[PDB]
Amino acid sequence: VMIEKVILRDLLRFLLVYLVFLFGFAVALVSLSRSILDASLELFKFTIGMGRFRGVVLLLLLAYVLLTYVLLLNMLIALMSETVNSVATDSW
Amino acid sequence: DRDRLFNVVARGNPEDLAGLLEYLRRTSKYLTDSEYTEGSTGKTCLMKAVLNLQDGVNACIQPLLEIDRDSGNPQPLVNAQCTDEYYRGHSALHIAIEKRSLQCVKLLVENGANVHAKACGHFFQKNQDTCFYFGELPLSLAACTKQWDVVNYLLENPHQPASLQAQDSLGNTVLHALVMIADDSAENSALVVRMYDGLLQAGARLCPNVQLEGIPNLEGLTPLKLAAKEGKIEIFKHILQREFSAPCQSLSRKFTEWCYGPVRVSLYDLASVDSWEENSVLEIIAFHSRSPHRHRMVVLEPLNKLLQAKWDRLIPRFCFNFLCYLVYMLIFTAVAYHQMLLLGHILILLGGVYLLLGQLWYFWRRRLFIWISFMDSYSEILFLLQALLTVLSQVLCFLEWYLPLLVSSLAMGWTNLLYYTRGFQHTGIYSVMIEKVILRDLLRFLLVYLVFLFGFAVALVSLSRSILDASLELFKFTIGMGEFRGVVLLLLLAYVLLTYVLLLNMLIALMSETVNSVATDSWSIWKLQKAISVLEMENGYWWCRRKKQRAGVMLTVGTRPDGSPDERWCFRVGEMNWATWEQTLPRTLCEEPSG
Amino acid sequence: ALVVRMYDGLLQAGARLCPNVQLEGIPNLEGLTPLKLAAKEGKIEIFKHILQREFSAPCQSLSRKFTEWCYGPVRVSLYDLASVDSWEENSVLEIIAFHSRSPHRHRMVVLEPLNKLLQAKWDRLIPRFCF
Amino acid sequence: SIWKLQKAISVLEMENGYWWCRRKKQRAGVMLTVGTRPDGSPDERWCFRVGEMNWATWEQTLPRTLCEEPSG
Numbered sequence: 001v002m003i004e005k006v007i008l009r010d011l012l013r014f015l016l017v018y019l020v021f022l023f024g025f026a027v028a029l030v031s032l033s034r035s036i037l038d039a040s041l042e043l044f045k046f047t048i049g050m051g052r053f054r055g056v057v058l059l060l061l062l063a064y065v066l067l068t069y070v071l072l073l074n075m076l077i078a079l080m081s082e083t084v085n086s087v088a089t090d091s092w
Numbered sequence: 093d094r095d096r097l098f099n100v101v102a103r104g105n106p107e108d109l110a111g112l113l114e115y116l117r118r119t120s121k122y123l124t125d126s127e128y129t130e131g132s133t134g135k136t137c138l139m140k141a142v143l144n145l146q147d148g149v150n151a152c153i154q155p156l157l158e159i160d161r162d163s164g165n166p167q168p169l170v171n172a173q174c175t176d177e178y179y180r181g182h183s184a185l186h187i188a189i190e191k192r193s194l195q196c197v198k199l200l201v202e203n204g205a206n207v208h209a210k211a212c213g214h215f216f217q218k219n220q221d222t223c224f225y226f227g228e229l230p231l232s233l234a235a236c237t238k239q240w241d242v243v244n245y246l247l248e249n250p251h252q253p254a255s256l257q258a259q260d261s262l263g264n265t266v267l268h269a270l271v272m273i274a275d276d277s278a279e280n281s282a283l284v285v286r287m288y289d290g291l292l293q294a295g296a297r298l299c300p301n302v303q304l305e306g307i308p309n310l311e312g313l314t315p316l317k318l319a320a321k322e323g324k325i326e327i328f329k330h331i332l333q334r335e336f337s338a339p340c341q342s343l344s345r346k347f348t349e350w351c352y353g354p355v356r357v358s359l360y361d362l363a364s365v366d367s368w369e370e371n372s373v374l375e376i377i378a379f380h381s382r383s384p385h386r387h388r389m390v391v392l393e394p395l396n397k398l399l400q401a402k403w404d405r406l407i408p409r410f411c412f413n414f415l416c417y418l419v420y421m422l423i424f425t426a427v428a429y430h431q432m433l434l435l436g437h438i439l440i441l442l443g444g445v446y447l448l449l450g451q452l453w454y455f456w457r458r459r460l461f462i463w464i465s466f467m468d469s470y471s472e473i474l475f476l477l478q479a480l481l482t483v484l485s486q487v488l489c490f491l492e493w494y495l496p497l498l499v500s501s502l503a504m505g506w507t508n509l510l511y512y513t514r515g516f517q518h519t520g521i522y523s524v525m526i527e528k529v530i531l532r533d534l535l536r537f538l539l540v541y542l543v544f545l546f547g548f549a550v551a552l553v554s555l556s557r558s559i560l561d562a563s564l565e566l567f568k569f570t571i572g573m574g575e576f577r578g579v580v581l582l583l584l585l586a587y588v589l590l591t592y593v594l595l596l597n598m599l600i601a602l603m604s605e606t607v608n609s610v611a612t613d614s615w616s617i618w619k620l621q622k623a624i625s626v627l628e629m630e631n632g633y634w635w636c637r638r639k640k641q642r643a644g645v646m647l648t649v650g651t652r653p654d655g656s657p658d659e660r661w662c663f664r665v666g667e668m669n670w671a672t673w674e675q676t677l678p679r680t681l682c683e684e685p686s687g
Numbered sequence: 688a689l690v691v692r693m694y695d696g697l698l699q700a701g702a703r704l705c706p707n708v709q710l711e712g713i714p715n716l717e718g719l720t721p722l723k724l725a726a727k728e729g730k731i732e733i734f735k736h737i738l739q740r741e742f743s744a745p746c747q748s749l750s751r752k753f754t755e756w757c758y759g760p761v762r763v764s765l766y767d768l769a770s771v772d773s774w775e776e777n778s779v780l781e782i783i784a785f786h787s788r789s790p791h792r793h794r795m796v797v798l799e800p801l802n803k804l805l806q807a808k809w810d811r812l813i814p815r816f817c818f
Numbered sequence: 819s820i821w822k823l824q825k826a827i828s829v830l831e832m833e834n835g836y837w838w839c840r841r842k843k844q845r846a847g848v849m850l851t852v853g854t855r856p857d858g859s860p861d862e863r864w865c866f867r868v869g870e871m872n873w874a875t876w877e878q879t880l881p882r883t884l885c886e887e888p889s890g
């Protein structure tokens with residue numbers, strides 16, 4: 001019940017954020033190299049780890065990793081603030 | 093002699109002062125001469141006398157004034173002022189008011205004191221430390237120190253009637269000073285509101301024609317606006333919801349339109365709160381306010397109902413630019429995909445010029461307001477930044493390094509889509525929490541990592557000449573992408589350990605701690621941000637949104653003290669109370685409950 | 688409440704019966720006056736009471752705090768710093784800083800004749816810190 | 819309070835000085851006359867000032883003050 005409640009709280013919003021940034025990074029790699037669909041599949045399997053120039057690639061990696069840390073911390077503190085604001089008696 | 097004289101007045105012995113008048117007749121000098129004054133911060137014997145009161149009185153004062161009057165002193169003793177930049181203009185009368193003696197005040201006024209004499213020293217300024225600010229006039233001092241009798245006396249004296257219209261060097265009047273001294277404590281609150289109400293009634297009695305709230309200071313601020321500006325909560329609350337059962341009911345703002353069972357409809361006046369007028373109260377809470385409790389002001393009834401109405405009227409215009417900006421980001425994702433691309437890229441250059449002109453109009457119009465706004469202007473900064481990045485990438489693509497700026501502008505546009513999450517409640521709560529946190533604490537965490545990363549990158553570069561490639565090898569090591577050996581490995585583990593099990597860890601805890609401090613007040617910040625949105629929208633794009641409507645309905649509520657009736661604009665709000673039968677019915681103006 | 692009442696009564700009685708002698712000046716074998724000793728062990732309430740004393744008695748010379756002048760809500764208080772200044776050898780501040788062994792030293796820091804003095808010295812020496 | 823403590827540590831260390839001594843350090847405060855003792859000789863002490871703002875002052879009347887006017 002808590003899992004479904006927190007999913008209904010956060011999932012759609014965080015998914016829209018991640019989809020917006022994913023299409024951004026995908027079209028970015030498409031311009032950098034493969035259209036946005038193929039670059040989207042490649043970037044999605046790149047972040048999962050499945051699989052001058054090195055400076056640009058590392059700058060994209062630094063930006064994505066720290067931004068993903070920002071979003072992960074945001075979802076963490078949002079779940080914490082919601083849980084602290086949550087009523088905990090009425091679960092019974 | 094001056095030391096003898098000061099011992100006389102501190103003694104307060106009249107017969108000890110006898111013969112000094114003949115001593116002055118023989119001496120043929122004046123009591124205003126510098127010999128009988130102290131050099132630095134030149135005060136007089138009279139001020140020393142008034143400082144030294146024997147059980148509320150002092151006997152030497154009237155014979156001393158008679159001595160100066162018989163002395164042929166052109167400038168009299170009483171109106172003389174101090175000299176110091178610390179202390180200028182201070183009088184005997186200021187002291188007598190501070191030492192709480194009506195009798196000495198009556199004596200000074202009966203001997204031709206000044207009432208408009210005002211003290212402009214550094215001690216009488218708000219910005220300093222260990223200093224007292226009350227405005228500058230004596231009547232203001234009587235008001236601030238809750239001496240109602242002295243106020244009644246200074247208004248009602250025959251000789252020198254005080255003027256409520258009068259104002260100091262900063263143009264502040266009595267009401268402005270009462271605003272300036274207000275803090276959060278309960279006794280201060282009760283005293284200020286009682287004094288404020290009594291002063292309005294007395295100003296009604298003495299200058300009925302003048303609207304006392306209307307006078308602004310040098311900054312063009314009326315006392316309601318100044319009350320808003322300094323985060324003064326309680327007096328502001330009381331000024332909005334203000335009702336007089338007096339004959340002078342016209343001073344009041346709240347009215348009851350009709351009442352029927354538990355349902356009644358309240359009228360509030362809205363003359364200053366209207367966003368139509370220049371320097372609205374809403375624009376001043378929004379932009380010019382530097383208060384920490386600016387969120388706390390918004391919860392009050394007319395503000396809440398008005399912002400709720402404006403936002404519910406506004407929601408389709410919000411959804412309109414939501415879809416427009418999403419379609420623009422779609423077109424730019426397409427042009428980035430196909431780099432059919434040429435005309436799309438020309439449209440993207442047009443859109444970059446559009447966002448550039450919009451943010452240029454925003455920040456070009458207001459600069460000092462941008463300096464005030466920098467604590468929370470985080471969104472329009474990112475909009476101007478994305479516009480500048482897109483401008484640079486399009487101009488350089490019209491001419492080798494344009495692709496990094498292009499991918500930065502694309503990523504920042506599709507993340508700037510997050511601005512429009514503020515429409516719904518919980519999404520706006522999460523986004524505003526994230527934006528307020530990232531201003532507060534994320535900048536500290538960013539600085540700490542970079543020094544250690546620079547050290548470890550130069551470390552590997554010296555251990556195993558481009559600092560960039562050194563940082564490349566280091567972040568490829570730390571993220572796990574790519575690669576004495578044992579000692580170096582140990583250092584890397586230690587470096588990796590610290591990298592994630594310290595900064596990240598401590599920062600997260602601090603953020604959690606920070607959240608608790610800001611906890612249970614989020615709804616107010618959410619309600620606030622919508623105000624910014626609606627006001628902006630009210631402002632419109634480069635294509636303008638001028639000719640915004642009024643907020644209320646016009647209803648002539650009673651009659652003025654002047655014979656003319658008083659048309660006002662008013663915003664009506666419903667209310668349901670079940671404790672009503674205990675209370676007596678309020679005075680009403682509309683009989684039939686219809687419309 | 689016991690300690691502050693008894694301490695003040697003893698000071699008044701010692702003023703009455705041995706007027707030449709200043710009782711709080713006498714150190715122990717470790718060489719500490721009672722103010723320093725109360726600082727060193729981290730006893731708080733008695734310390735707070737010792738710093739800001741007043742006496743409406745004919746003998747107010749025992750007391751440390753005074754009032755320079757008063758005007759509206761503003762008033763200006765004097766304090767003595769005859770043992771508190773870092774100028775002197777084996778000061779109270781050196782004892783709170785180094786020689787103490789108490790957990791709660793931080794609560795002893797935030798007191799009025801300490802706090803204004805620390806602020807004055809800190810803002811006196813900002814540029815050497817930046818240097 | 820911890821931050822005030824750290825500043826106190828730092829200000830004591832910086833007043834101690836470098837390898838070159840920070841000697842001739844200025845005594846704080848100002849010498850005044852508080853009064854005379856039960857001994858006929860006067861009291862003379864070093865002193866430091868502080869400001870306060872209190873709004874209960876109409877409930878509880880003012881204490882004795884040696885300085886008449888606000889000075890410096």
Ligand SMILES: C=C(C)[C@]12C[C@@H](C)[C@@]34O[C@](Cc5ccccc5)(O[C@@H]1[C@@H]3C=C(COC(=O)Cc1ccc(O)c(OC)c1)C[C@]1(O)C(=O)C(C)=C[C@@H]41)O2
Nearest residue numbers: 062063066067470471474500503504507508509510511527
């Ligand atoms: C300090 C600032 C201004 C900032 C500038 C750039 C570098 C930025 O990285 C950050 C921190 C950073 C640095 C390196 C890697 C990741 C994150 O956050 C923003 C800044 C953060 C992101 C994420 O977008 C947001 O800030 C959320 C947001 C959107 C719209 C808003 O109106 C808003 O205000 C409420 C907040 C956008 C970037 O510009 C982007 O897409 C790229 C290229 C990196 C992002 O720095």
